[PDB]
Structure formats: C-alpha cells, structure tokens
C-alpha cells in the first residue's frame, strides 16, 4: 500500500473509530501508524500486517 506518503506492507480493513476532520493519520501508545484516510473516498482504514 502507498497512501500518498507511506510505502509498507499491511492488511487494510474498515475502521469504526471516530476521526476529527482535521486528523488523518493515527498512532498508538507504541507510536505506530495505525489508521489512515484515503484521499479519493474520505474513508478511514486500519492497517494490520
């Protein structure tokens, strides 16, 4: 997956966690790239390798 800034390998699934319209990228207490907002369709996706 290459979401406009991020090369990597992971399973892309649908998420249910609420996102602020200003917030796109998500982190964790283990500060890893968890969620992402697709540009074409404003949809929130979780990444899990």
């Amino acid at each position: 997956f290459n979401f406009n800034g991020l090369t990597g390998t992971g399973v892309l699934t649908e998420s249910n966690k609420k996102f602020l319209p200003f917030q796109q990228f998500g982190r964790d207490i283990a500060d890893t790239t968890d969620a992402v907002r697709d540009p074409q369709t404003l949809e929130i996706l979780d990444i899990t390798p």
Partner: protein, 49 residues
Amino acid sequence: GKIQDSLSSTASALGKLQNVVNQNAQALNTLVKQLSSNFGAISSVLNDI
C-alpha cells in the same frame, strides 16, 4: 477466617508478585519507544529514508 478476610480486603500485600509484572512491562515499553528516535539521522522510519 481472619486470613481469608485479610486477603479479600487488602490488595497491596500481593505487591511482591505485582511488582514483578510491572517491571517486565516497563522494559518492553521502553524498547518499543526506542524505535521513534532519530539517533542523529534525518528520520526514524527506514522506509522513509
């Protein structure tokens, strides 16, 4: 009866085990948190560079 009441009520007396667990967890956290360090480079992501 007294000892079972004491174990039911007071929770700090088990710390002898509890501390152990905490210690282990702490280490792992730091290790993971060590990934987000520049170490003098330009970024903390191998894919980025």
